[PDB]
Design a binder for this molecule. Structure first.
Ligand SMILES: [Mg+2]
Length: 258
């Protein structure tokens, strides 16, 4: 009988601060040193793609511009990839499709086993560089991530609330970000969508398709694409422009019992 909410999030400058570190927009808007901002921004970028290329077959999967990890699960035979050798498996369109599905599934496996042990995934000494980077970033952003997480965790813990992510970032890179920003635990991987290809209103429609019409969808984000797509589908939109907006959201999450 319970009413159910579906929270559709944007990533960059909504849940995390990353791109705006490279443009000087954040440092400028909140009076931070621009030079440190760019330095921090480029280090994360390096870590994001290094993780992507090194563990998430990014050099292989990049040109596939896939939307959801399970999009090619038709061609997955379900065998154990523990001992499977991806490097020397020659990576066509049907025998090739199985090899693609294998990588996306291994990515999914990596994500689930390391979502709460990212330092274990990237290993040392990168782990320490990461923890220090995350600390530098958290300070310069005045605890932005701390704010977004409070809302994400309230949604997670709440029984009739769900967390969905729709980002224009490509899929593999988007997963690397999520992991490096400690969002693996709050976002079930089957809930991440890459709108790089289809566009956001497509993903939104698809998400409604998936959760039904009886659900109340809330589009959360800082950008126009997200907001415009919320209009097409007459989905309430919650804009995030500062820490205050993330607090307003957490507050609302805190008052309702479904
Ligand atoms: Mg954004």
């Amino acid at each position: 009988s319970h009413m159910e909410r579906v929270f559709v999030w944007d990533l960059d400058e909504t849940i995390i601060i990353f791109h705006s570190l490279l443009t000087g927009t954040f440092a400028s808007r909140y009076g931070k040193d621009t030079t440190t901002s760019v330095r921090i921004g480029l280090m994360m970028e390096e870590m994001i793609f290094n993780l992507a290329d090194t563990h998430l077959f990014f050099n292989d999967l990049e040109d596939c511009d896939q939307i959801h990890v399970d999009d090619v699960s038709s061609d997955d035979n379900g065998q154990d990839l523990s001992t499977y050798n991806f490097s020397a498996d020659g990576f066509g369109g049907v025998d090739w499709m199985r090899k693609l599905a294998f990588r996306y599934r291994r990515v999914k496996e990596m994500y689930n086993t390391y979502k709460n042990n990212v330092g274990g995934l990237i290993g040392t000494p990168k782990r320490e560089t990461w923890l220090q980077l995350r600390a530098e970033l958290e300070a310069l952003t005045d605890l932005w991530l701390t704010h977004s997480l409070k809302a994400l965790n309230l949604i997670n813990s709440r029984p009739n609330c769900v967390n969905v992510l729709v980002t224009t970032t490509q899929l593999i890179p988007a997963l690397a970000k999520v992991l490096l920003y400690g969002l693996g635990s709050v976002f079930p991987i089957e809930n991440i969508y890459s709108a790089t290809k289809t566009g956001k209103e497509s993903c939104f429609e698809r998400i409604m398709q998936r959760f039904g019409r009886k659900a109340v969808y809330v589009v959360i984000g800082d950008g126009v694409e997200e907001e415009q797509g919320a209009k097409k589908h007459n989905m309430p939109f919650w804009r995030i422009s500062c820490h205050a907006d993330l607090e307003a959201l957490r507050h609302a999450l805190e008052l309702e019992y479904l």
